[PDB]
Amino acid sequence: KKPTNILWIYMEDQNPWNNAWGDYTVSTPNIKKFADQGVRFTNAHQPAPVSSATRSALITGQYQTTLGLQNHRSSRASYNATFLPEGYKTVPELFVDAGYQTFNIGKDDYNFKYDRSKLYNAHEGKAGFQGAHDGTKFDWANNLKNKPFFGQIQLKGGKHHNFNGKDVPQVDPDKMTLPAYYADTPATRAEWAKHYKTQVLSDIELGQILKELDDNNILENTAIFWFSDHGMLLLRHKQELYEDGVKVPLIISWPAGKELLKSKGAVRNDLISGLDIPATSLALAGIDIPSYYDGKNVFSEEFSGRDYVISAKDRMDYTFDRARSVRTEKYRYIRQYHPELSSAQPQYRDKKQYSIEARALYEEGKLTPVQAAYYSPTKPVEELYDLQSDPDQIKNLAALPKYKKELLRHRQILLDWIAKTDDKGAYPESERAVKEVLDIWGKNCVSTQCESYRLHHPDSVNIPGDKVYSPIQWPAYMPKPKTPYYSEIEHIYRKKFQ
Amino acid sequence: QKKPTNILWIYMEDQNPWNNAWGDYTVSTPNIKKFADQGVRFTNAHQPAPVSSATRSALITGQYQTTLGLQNHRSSRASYNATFLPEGYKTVPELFVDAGYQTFNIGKDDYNFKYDRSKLYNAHEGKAGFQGAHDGTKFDWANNLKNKPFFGQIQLKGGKHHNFNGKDVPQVDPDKMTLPAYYADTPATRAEWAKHYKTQVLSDIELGQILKELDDNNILENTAIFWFSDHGMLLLRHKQELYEDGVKVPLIISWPAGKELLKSKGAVRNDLISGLDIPATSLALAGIDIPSYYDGKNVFSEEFSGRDYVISAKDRMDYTFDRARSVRTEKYRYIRQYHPELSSAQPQYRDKKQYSIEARALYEEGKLTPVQAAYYSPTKPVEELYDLQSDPDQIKNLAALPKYKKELLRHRQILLDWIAKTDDKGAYPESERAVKEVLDIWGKNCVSTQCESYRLHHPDSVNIPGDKVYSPIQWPAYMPKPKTPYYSEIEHIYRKKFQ
Ligand SMILES: O=S(=O)(O)OC[C@H]1O[C@H](O[C@H]2[C@@H](O)[C@@H](CO)O[C@@H](O[C@@H]3[C@H](O)[C@@H](OS(=O)(=O)O)[C@@H](O[C@H]4[C@@H](O)[C@@H](CO)O[C@@H](O)[C@@H]4OS(=O)(=O)O)O[C@@H]3COS(=O)(=O)O)[C@@H]2OS(=O)(=O)O)[C@H](OS(=O)(=O)O)[C@@H](O)[C@H]1O
Ligand SMILES: O=S(=O)(O)OC[C@H]1O[C@H](O[C@H]2[C@@H](O)[C@@H](CO)O[C@@H](O[C@@H]3[C@H](O)[C@@H](OS(=O)(=O)O)[C@@H](O[C@H]4[C@@H](O)[C@@H](CO)O[C@@H](O)[C@@H]4OS(=O)(=O)O)O[C@@H]3COS(=O)(=O)O)[C@@H]2OS(=O)(=O)O)[C@H](OS(=O)(=O)O)[C@@H](O)[C@H]1O
Numbered sequence A: 001k002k003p004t005n006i007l008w009i010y011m012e013d014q015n016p017w018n019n020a021w022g023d024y025t026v027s028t029p030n031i032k033k034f035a036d037q038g039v040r041f042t043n044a045h046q047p048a049p050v051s052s053a054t055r056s057a058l059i060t061g062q063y064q065t066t067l068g069l070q071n072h073r074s075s076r077a078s079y080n081a082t083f084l085p086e087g088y089k090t091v092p093e094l095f096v097d098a099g100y101q102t103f104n105i106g107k108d109d110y111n112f113k114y115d116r117s118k119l120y121n122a123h124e125g126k127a128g129f130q131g132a133h134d135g136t137k138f139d140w141a142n143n144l145k146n147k148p149f150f151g152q153i154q155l156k157g158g159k160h161h162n163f164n165g166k167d168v169p170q171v172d173p174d175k176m177t178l179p180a181y182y183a184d185t186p187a188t189r190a191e192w193a194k195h196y197k198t199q200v201l202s203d204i205e206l207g208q209i210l211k212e213l214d215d216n217n218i219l220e221n222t223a224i225f226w227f228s229d230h231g232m233l234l235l236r237h238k239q240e241l242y243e244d245g246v247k248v249p250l251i252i253s254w255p256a257g258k259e260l261l262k263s264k265g266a267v268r269n270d271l272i273s274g275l276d277i278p279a280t281s282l283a284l285a286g287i288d289i290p291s292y293y294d295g296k297n298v299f300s301e302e303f304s305g306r307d308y309v310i311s312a313k314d315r316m317d318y319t320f321d322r323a324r325s326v327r328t329e330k331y332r333y334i335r336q337y338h339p340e341l342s343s344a345q346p347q348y349r350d351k352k353q354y355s356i357e358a359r360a361l362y363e364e365g366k367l368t369p370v371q372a373a374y375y376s377p378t379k380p381v382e383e384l385y386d387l388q389s390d391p392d393q394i395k396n397l398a399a400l401p402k403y404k405k406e407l408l409r410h411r412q413i414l415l416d417w418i419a420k421t422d423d424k425g426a427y428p429e430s431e432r433a434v435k436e437v438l439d440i441w442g443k444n445c446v447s448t449q450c451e452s453y454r455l456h457h458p459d460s461v462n463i464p465g466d467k468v469y470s471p472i473q474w475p476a477y478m479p480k481p482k483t484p485y486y487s488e489i490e491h492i493y494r495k496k497f498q
Numbered sequence B: 001q002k003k004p005t006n007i008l009w010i011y012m013e014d015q016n017p018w019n020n021a022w023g024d025y026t027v028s029t030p031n032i033k034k035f036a037d038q039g040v041r042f043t044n045a046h047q048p049a050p051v052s053s054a055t056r057s058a059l060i061t062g063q064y065q066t067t068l069g070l071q072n073h074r075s076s077r078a079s080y081n082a083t084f085l086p087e088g089y090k091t092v093p094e095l096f097v098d099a100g101y102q103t104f105n106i107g108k109d110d111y112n113f114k115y116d117r118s119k120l121y122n123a124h125e126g127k128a129g130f131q132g133a134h135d136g137t138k139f140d141w142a143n144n145l146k147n148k149p150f151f152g153q154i155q156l157k158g159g160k161h162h163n164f165n166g167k168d169v170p171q172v173d174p175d176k177m178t179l180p181a182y183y184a185d186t187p188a189t190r191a192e193w194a195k196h197y198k199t200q201v202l203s204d205i206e207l208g209q210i211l212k213e214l215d216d217n218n219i220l221e222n223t224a225i226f227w228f229s230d231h232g233m234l235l236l237r238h239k240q241e242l243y244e245d246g247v248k249v250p251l252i253i254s255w256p257a258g259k260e261l262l263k264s265k266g267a268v269r270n271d272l273i274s275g276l277d278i279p280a281t282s283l284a285l286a287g288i289d290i291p292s293y294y295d296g297k298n299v300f301s302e303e304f305s306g307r308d309y310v311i312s313a314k315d316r317m318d319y320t321f322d323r324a325r326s327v328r329t330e331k332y333r334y335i336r337q338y339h340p341e342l343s344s345a346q347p348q349y350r351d352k353k354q355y356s357i358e359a360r361a362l363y364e365e366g367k368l369t370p371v372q373a374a375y376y377s378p379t380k381p382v383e384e385l386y387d388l389q390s391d392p393d394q395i396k397n398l399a400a401l402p403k404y405k406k407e408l409l410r411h412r413q414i415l416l417d418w419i420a421k422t423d424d425k426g427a428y429p430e431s432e433r434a435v436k437e438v439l440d441i442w443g444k445n446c447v448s449t450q451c452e453s454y455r456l457h458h459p460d461s462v463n464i465p466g467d468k469v470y471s472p473i474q475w476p477a478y479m480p481k482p483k484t485p486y487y488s489e490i491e492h493i494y495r496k497k498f499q
């Protein structure tokens, strides 16, 4: 027995602050039911804490660092291009070859160039944000009720702002309990309260999709994967490698096979990677998992939980940095490759009130040492956290002789992973890639990489990159589509940021 | 459970097995014959490259040279252009060092990455080699290590020997040489054929010397010897090219105290193996785990039954930019040509050799047969496919014949599977710093599109030494650069006379 369809319900920027995880701050009845009749994973760790790196990893089936897709965002300009290897199959292409209809409604946001019609054959693409393709809305549930499909539905998750419905409860910022590493500021409490409100909106949106499936008699035969790309928007969640930056909600539901999926436990606490989502989607559909994919079928008789899970952070917008984390059963380890750069480096959230207010308290000397660690001008080279005693990860154990054995063990796990994958974050980005950062962000970039670029190009620094550099021609095995929006997504230059 | 005490590679340059153990009795090769008779002889060992630095880099890292960006001959030699192996990576010698062995390589390394040689070879010191390579210094290894388990390599000149004045070397008449049909019959071509036979005798003498040194130090029985060459001989469709005798090399493995164990699957092994299986088999015999990322297998494991196919790759060679991949199955050799617009006779380092001039002269005069003239045509086919039982000289391309379309597609997809799983770095253009390194060494000899474009983009610095154009690359924190003087010497690759 196998499901007829695979569906990813794919949310942005959301942690599982809902009833199925035991949080009754707000009411999330659809999610609670959905989890009760499916399999809920309490230890699903995405390989990145930011959109394009996680989404590129999951769609290619490998850590984003292995194929050079790690930098958020990259390969968007006309003059800077990453193409997947000749013969390579992304997860949608594997479903296409097996005869499925494929679609992704909403953003792709992949850090390579591609003919979208080869991935998603059931609808048209259009231009998205910052060089991304988006898939157009269409009546997927009716058009494909008699056609096996692999689909994705992109939802806003933590990026929702529409709280005007009568169903959205009051959440008092004054009654929020903030973790000890965040400054207690009005805008920080407000974002905490707002993230709870987005749980109700995700609950509503989950209900909409299940109803559409039921109305078209494809509820029973569809395996749904329900997860987010990374944690919520505050400064030590999204963009960072702590527990709730990368650990995401995940529920898997296949009503006609629910007893099979539940065999290993309806609540799954073993370590899995987000990379196991595409591998399990293929296995459930009956499609061989390519040898080069990193993920596993989490429902196979052989799968007993990962010994460790890796996450990676690299460049984010104009913030150049590199760090890697190893999560074992009991510890989280972070290796910092730029200890000379502050975690409070300039970044895209710098004009948000929650960031302004926190930084202000730091400069006035009013933060606790736990709150101020983020703002110190340097980082430790290694962090190690005992997650049972220190779930907020505020007690670095890496300098304690009692923990040197665990530190060395985690340090070598990372080395094993770098050696076998040749982590491409070890190598500096090309000058053409730096120019793409400058096209989009201009004077916001203050990195050593950007200052070096400007010194080297005094006559063209503010000229749009597609007037400085020749376009990259696409490979013979993947000709460039003539579809107009492929030109649109490459117009990344923003005059206002120069 | 028995294991040899030592591993020894007898590592020859540019040599095909034209010796008695392969049935060739043109000259007498008694040491090689006896060595093969008492060991295991491999008749289908295919190196992953037809040129020195690409093969040697592959075998020392345990992976296809194309996977780690080591495929371009030569690369990573200058001060300003550097490839470093990944953090945490273990080369084959490093694995032996960690297991407590003494390690050495006497003669050239010629690897396409930067490295602290002392971490690979802990029993002797390096010195400056040719074109940016490290060389290992000569020392009395057999006496120094007769009581210390070791992994050693002894580099021999093979086909590059050219001192034939010893009384031990027979006369070989160029007029009685039989050349293959794709070579022009010219005096200098016949002369190189005869010379290659003479180098078989020189390799035979040297093998006997090494076995005697081992026996003189009571390490003959407890040493597993791997006897092989890095690729085929120097003529134009052997070395540098992906035909059968470019990449298929001699290989004998001999471990006298384990002789019955090694022979269990056969004293003559015709199954397909890769040169990458040499380091993997060396590790397994010594009892060292083969890393998960290595490509090779233990050819003596009960599970090993021969590869279904073997891949070889050619990329840049000196200033000749090109890219081609071959798939060798039981019956066929397939070649995919990624630059069909470039002639196989495009400019290359052998252009001033008389055997090359004489053959090209015959081409220009219209005196070559169509089989001889194919090499000199202005374009290459996009794909080549040869039935090796019917066409061992690979002179009848089957790729355009409908009877062979199923095999063509089968081989084409084997290559695609391998590109997808390894991310073949030859798909990507070399950096401007890497191109400048070619220009330092070869100057105006480079006429490739890459070099012409580099000059067009650097019109004021074309002949300035690269180390004056580009800042030196700093070595990673996990592998600091040694202060040893010769490390600066090997980076001086600029040649004024070629500018
Ligand atoms: O230009 S950047 O945002 O700096 O690009 C870098 C950034 O891109 C991705 O995230 C942003 C994008 O998804 C864009 C798409 O338009 O929207 C951004 O959200 C904007 C604000 O950051 C956000 O403020 S916040 O209160 O959530 O923190 C939000 O603000 C709107 C709301 O306040 C509503 C009601 O309250 O009123 C609006 O006026 C506010 O918009 S604003 O006045 O223009 O600031 O919505 C903003 C735009 O949304 S819109 O409806 O399309 O107009 C995203 O930034 S976000 O803070 O992260 O959500 C990348 O996110 S990803 O990795 O998840 O893909 C992000 O990492 C970074 O690359
Ligand atoms: O500068 S290059 O050779 O163009 O570098 C590119 C080349 O390097 C590798 O192979 C060469 C090197 O190993 C160097 C080391 O010095 O020597 C080269 O051999 C020289 C001649 O090419 C060779 O021509 S041959 O057809 O006769 O074999 C040979 O010529 C000598 C003989 O003819 C004898 C007998 O008359 O007299 C000598 O005077 C000749 O030497 S000459 O002064 O050049 O006329 O020997 C030469 C140097 O030999 S010596 O020991 O220094 O005295 C190698 O080129 S070879 O033809 O392929 O052997 C690369 O080879 S590798 O992949 O195996 O490492 C090669 O691919 C290429 O990169």
Ligand SMILES: [Ca+2]
Residues within 6 Å of the ligand: A011, A012, A013, A050, A051, A229, A230
């Ligand atoms: Ca997101």
Ligand SMILES: [Ca+2]
Residues within 6 Å of the ligand: B012, B013, B014, B051, B052, B230, B231
């Ligand atoms: Ca050689």
Ligand SMILES: [Cl-]
Residues within 6 Å of the ligand: A051, A107, A109, A129
């Ligand atoms: Cl976005």
Ligand SMILES: [Cl-]
Residues within 6 Å of the ligand: A381
């Ligand atoms: Cl360290």
